[PDB]
Amino acid sequence: EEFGRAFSF
Amino acid sequence: IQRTPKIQVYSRHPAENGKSNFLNCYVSGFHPSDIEVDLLKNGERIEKVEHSDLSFSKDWSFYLLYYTEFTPTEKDEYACRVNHVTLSQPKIVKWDRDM
Amino acid sequence: GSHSMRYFYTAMSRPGRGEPRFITVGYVDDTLFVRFDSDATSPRKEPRAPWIEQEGPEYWDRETQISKTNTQCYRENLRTALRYYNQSEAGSHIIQRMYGCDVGPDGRLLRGYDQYAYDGKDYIALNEDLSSWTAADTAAQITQRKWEAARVAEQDRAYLEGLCVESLRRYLENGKETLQRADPPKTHVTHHPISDHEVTLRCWALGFYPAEITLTWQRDGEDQTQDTELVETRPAGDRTFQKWAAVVVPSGEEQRYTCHVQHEGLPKPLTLRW
């Protein structure tokens, strides 16, 4: 299962 | 800033004339990801060749497997033809059943 | 033994040819189990191994939503990278990410990863402590400052110590027929005369899983590192892998050479000769 939080560059 | 593909052409199982098998062209170590690969039988393109999903190695370089069913014979010649931004001309690697 | 789960993202801009393409693939060990492609006709997370097919509809909806959000997020990241490197909007560029976890035989976290590249070069990576970052250049230092301010490392750590290992443990159980089976190499030596004076000995390993393997040649018991041609391990297409190693030897001297094979499916390393 993937991590559902993305963080912008 | 770019990396040229390594190319191997080989069969899934040891080749035996008249027995069905899979012809594989494995391209790896390249960057960027755009690449064109044809499988050739007697110099002509084999239709409906399939390929794997784009993935990459620890050094970030990409790899792909192109493959098709084939029945090798004594006289039929097979090859892989690869184009990539790093190549001034397409590179042809002939299938050798011993490699 | 030990096991790994990894997700691999590739985001590729292509000015004049639409918006950047976003791809994800997921692996357990050397087994692909899921994929996503924004260029697909109806982009969704799709199963690629039989043991993931039993995950319910909520799993697939959540995984697809993550990937659809990522398509947009990574298009923004590509625009940001152009700014950070003073680059033109005319060129094509690539962001890559690999993240995931390794577990030991008891299922406990051995280590976690979250690392990124821009145009094929390292950009930023979570350190093994799961609490700090290594930035490759002053551009990535801008990202690092943002991620420190937002405590991104702590959020990654909570995932890597929790859901990452928990889901990998479940996949290993559901896929125990394949993910927990090593297939040992089938090995043999072939002999190819080159001339009157020399012959190629080629040591073959076929049909093995996982991909990790060691193949070496020795002459009189001494490793032949500089004199061995070793091809990259390559996929057969049936889940298994292939590799060979070759040496050029003087005619008549074949018996001085031995091939040595190490693989986790072999209870003891193998020695072969022509």
Author numbering:
A (entry chain P): 1 to 9
B (entry chain B): 1 to 99
C (entry chain A): 1 to 274
What does the paper say about this structure?
Tapasin, a key component of the PLC, is a 48 kDa transmembrane glycoprotein that bridges the TAP transporter and MHC-I to facilitate peptide loading. Mechanistic insight has been hampered by the lack of detailed structural information concerning tapasin–MHC-I. We present here crystal structures of human tapasin complexed with the MHC-I molecule HLA-B*44:05, and with each of two anti-tapasin antibodies. Together this ensemble of crystal structures provides insights into a distinct mechanism of tapasin-mediated peptide exchange.
HLA-B*44:02 and HLA-B*44:05 (B44:02 and B44:05 hereafter), represent tapasin-dependent and tapasin-independent MHC-I molecules, respectively, based on their cell surface expression in tapasin-deficient cell lines. The two allelomorphs differ at a single residue in the F pocket region, Asp116 in B44:02 and Tyr116 in B44:05. The X-ray structures we describe here address several molecular states of an MHC-I molecule (B44:05) and of its associated chaperone (tapasin) in the course of PLC stabilization and peptide acquisition in the ER.
